[PDB]
Enzyme design. Structure first.
Site, PDB file in Angstrom:
ATOM      1  N   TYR A 198     -12.552   8.941  -1.083  1.00 54.03           N
ATOM      2  CA  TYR A 198     -11.818   9.035   0.185  1.00 54.03           C
ATOM      3  C   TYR A 198     -10.585   9.936   0.158  1.00 54.03           C
ATOM      4  O   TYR A 198     -10.357  10.690   1.099  1.00 54.03           O
ATOM      5  CB  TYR A 198     -11.491   7.653   0.773  1.00 54.03           C
ATOM      6  CG  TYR A 198     -10.464   6.815   0.033  1.00 54.03           C
ATOM      7  CD1 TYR A 198      -9.234   6.518   0.617  1.00 54.03           C
ATOM      8  CD2 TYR A 198     -10.739   6.285  -1.225  1.00 54.03           C
ATOM      9  CE1 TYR A 198      -8.292   5.724  -0.045  1.00 54.03           C
ATOM     10  CE2 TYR A 198      -9.810   5.494  -1.895  1.00 54.03           C
ATOM     11  CZ  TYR A 198      -8.589   5.219  -1.299  1.00 54.03           C
ATOM     12  OH  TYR A 198      -7.667   4.440  -1.968  1.00 54.03           O
ATOM     13  N   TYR A 238      -1.794  11.214   2.381  1.00 49.60           N
ATOM     14  CA  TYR A 238      -2.674  11.587   1.276  1.00 49.60           C
ATOM     15  C   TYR A 238      -2.699  13.102   1.063  1.00 49.60           C
ATOM     16  O   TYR A 238      -2.830  13.567  -0.062  1.00 49.60           O
ATOM     17  CB  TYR A 238      -4.100  11.073   1.511  1.00 49.60           C
ATOM     18  CG  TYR A 238      -4.230   9.564   1.585  1.00 49.60           C
ATOM     19  CD1 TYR A 238      -4.417   8.801   0.431  1.00 49.60           C
ATOM     20  CD2 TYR A 238      -4.178   8.900   2.811  1.00 49.60           C
ATOM     21  CE1 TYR A 238      -4.547   7.411   0.495  1.00 49.60           C
ATOM     22  CE2 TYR A 238      -4.304   7.516   2.884  1.00 49.60           C
ATOM     23  CZ  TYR A 238      -4.489   6.781   1.726  1.00 49.60           C
ATOM     24  OH  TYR A 238      -4.612   5.414   1.803  1.00 49.60           O
ATOM     25  N   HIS A 289      -7.848  -6.362  -0.582  1.00 46.37           N
ATOM     26  CA  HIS A 289      -6.699  -5.460  -0.393  1.00 46.37           C
ATOM     27  C   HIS A 289      -5.623  -5.924   0.603  1.00 46.37           C
ATOM     28  O   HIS A 289      -4.422  -5.810   0.327  1.00 46.37           O
ATOM     29  CB  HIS A 289      -7.182  -4.055  -0.016  1.00 46.37           C
ATOM     30  CG  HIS A 289      -6.074  -3.068   0.189  1.00 46.37           C
ATOM     31  ND1 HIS A 289      -5.449  -2.424  -0.856  1.00 46.37           N
ATOM     32  CD2 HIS A 289      -5.482  -2.618   1.320  1.00 46.37           C
ATOM     33  CE1 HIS A 289      -4.521  -1.612  -0.375  1.00 46.37           C
ATOM     34  NE2 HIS A 289      -4.523  -1.711   0.942  1.00 46.37           N
ATOM     35  N   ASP A 302       0.826  -1.225   0.000  1.00 47.44           N
ATOM     36  CA  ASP A 302       0.000   0.000   0.000  1.00 47.44           C
ATOM     37  C   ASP A 302       0.865   1.283   0.000  1.00 47.44           C
ATOM     38  O   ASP A 302       1.681   1.463  -0.908  1.00 47.44           O
ATOM     39  CB  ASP A 302      -1.004  -0.052   1.165  1.00 47.44           C
ATOM     40  CG  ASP A 302      -2.025   1.056   1.118  1.00 47.44           C
ATOM     41  OD1 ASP A 302      -2.904   1.024   0.229  1.00 47.44           O
ATOM     42  OD2 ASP A 302      -1.958   1.949   1.989  1.00 47.44           O
TER      43      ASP A 302
END
Length: 320
Positions: free
Chosen positions: A153, A234, A299, A104
């Site tokens: 998101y 992010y 995931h 990830d």
């Protein structure tokens, strides 16, 4: 021996390192919203086969301290790779090159580690996140917002405090359970004031891989730290896009194995499957092995399919 825990001062941080085993170093790098703890199964499997498994909590995560939560610009991909390079110099001073396994956000860090410092990595196993070829037109946030809209998101994560306030009355445990047990190929949606209502639930039998005790470990940690450190990654995506312009057209020259779950939302980003399977991925990563797609998996493959992930790591690194 049991898993050993220590603190290592690196790149302005006091970094928590979990360690198990002796022999050649394997560095494991977790993603969002996870911890060192995500590698629990692989650490044991590889340690019992003669390797030294090392797994940090990253900047802004778990027991790692020092990161300014009030300044998301300090969570850039450059700061992150800086942490890892400094870590390796501290904990692996007698191995010019080490094995790297990542997932990830960890995988994104690992790609850039390999671009910036290929002299440090002997071979790479990356999970979930394929090489992100820089789009010259716009950053990742803007690109995914154009496709999936304002409630996506990554878009909802952008303004500091906003998603934190959304999660606050829900509590870390419910947020984490909802995320960790997610199985749909669509991206996460967080409509304002709707909490977790827009995230579909999978049949309960499909999440038996996650015990209450394992869930509690994540929950207790994120209730202490909050989610800001993790979410700031992010928030740094726009600056990451600017900062990585020097590596347009550059190739990863490290031997690489890539593994992804069939239902991983990242795998279902428009254009991802074509990039991965039809040549683009191999062009950016010329020493990429045949891609591994785990049938029936989503995931969080290190926890969902621990035996398959562990064995895939062992078999690959044994080639060197």
């Amino acid at each position: 021996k049991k898993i050993e825990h220590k603190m290592v001062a690196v790149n302005g941080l006091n970094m928590h390192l979990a360690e198990l085993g002796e022999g050649p170093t394997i560095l494991f790098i977790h993603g969002f919203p996870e911890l060192w703890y995500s590698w629990r199964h692989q650490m044991v499997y590889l340690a019992e086969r003669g390797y030294r498994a090392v797994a940090p909590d990253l900047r802004g995560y778990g027991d790692t301290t020092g990161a300014p939560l009030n300044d998301p610009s300090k969570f850039s991909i450059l700061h992150l790779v800086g942490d890892v390079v400094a870590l390796l110099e501290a904990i692996a001073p007698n191995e010019e090159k080490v094995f790297v396994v990542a997932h990830d956000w960890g995988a994104l860090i690992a790609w850039h580690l390999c671009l910036f410092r290929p002299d440090k990595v002997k071979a790479l196993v990356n999970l979930s996140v394929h090489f992100s070829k820089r789009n010259p037109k716009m950053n990742v946030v803007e690109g995914l917002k154009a496709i999936f809209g304002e409630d996506h998101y990554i878009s909802r994560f952008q303004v500091p405090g906003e998603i934190e306030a959304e999660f606050a009355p829900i509590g870390a445990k419910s947020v984490l359970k909802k995320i960790l047990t997610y199985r749909d190929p669509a991206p996460f949606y967080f409509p304002k004031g709707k909490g977790l209502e827009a995230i579909p639930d999978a049949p309960v039998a499909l999440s038996s891989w996650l015990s209450e005790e394992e869930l509690d470990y994540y929950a207790n940690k994120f209730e202490q730290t909050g989610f800001t450190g993790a979410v700031n990654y992010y928030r740094a995506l726009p600056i990451n896009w600017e900062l990585t312009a020097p590596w347009t057209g550059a190739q990863v020259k490290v031997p690489t194995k890539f593994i992804v779950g069939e239902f991983d939302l990242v795998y279902h980003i428009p254009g991802a499957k074509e990039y991965i399977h039809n040549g683009g991925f191999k062009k950016d990563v010329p020493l990429l092995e045949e891609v591994v797609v785990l049938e029936g998996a989503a995931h969080f493959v290190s926890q969902e399919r621990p035996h398959e992930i562990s064995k895939h790591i062992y078999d690959f690194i044994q080639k060197f």
